[PDB]
Nucleic acid binder design. Structure first.
Ligand code: ZN
Ligand code: ZN
Ligand code: ZN
Length: 86
DNA sequence: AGCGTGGGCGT
DNA sequence: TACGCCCACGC
């Protein structure tokens, strides 16, 4: 069930967890509490800040098992590994 | 390709 | 509640 409803008028979104509603509300408030120290851009989410920072540093923690090519994000690696199929 | 950013959730 | 994985949609 999703007992936690968004109280903003135009919005009919609901959530299973209260913290997910609190995160969602930032969309409506525009709150972007996490600032990149390098370029000063602000982000809604701390995890998205971390991956953004890799655009500046070149850090690529995730290597393809088949070919060893490195990526900044796990989902980016995932999208890549499939190219090695038939 | 590079990468923003919500969806759902384990801890 | 925060932190931060995965997952997913969308340029
Ligand atoms: Zn809402
Ligand atoms: Zn930055
Ligand atoms: Zn590969």
């Amino acid at each position: 069930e999703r007992p936690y409803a968004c109280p903003v008028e135009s919005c009919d979104r609901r959530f299973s967890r209260s913290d997910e509603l609190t995160r969602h509300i930032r969309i409506h408030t525009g709150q972007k509490p996490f600032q990149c120290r390098i370029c000063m851009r602000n982000f809604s989410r701390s995890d998205h800040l971390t991956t953004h920072i890799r655009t500046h540093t070149g850090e690529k923690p995730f290597a393809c098992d088949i070919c060893g090519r490195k990526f900044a994000r796990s989902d980016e690696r995932k999208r890549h590994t499939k190219i090695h199929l038939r």
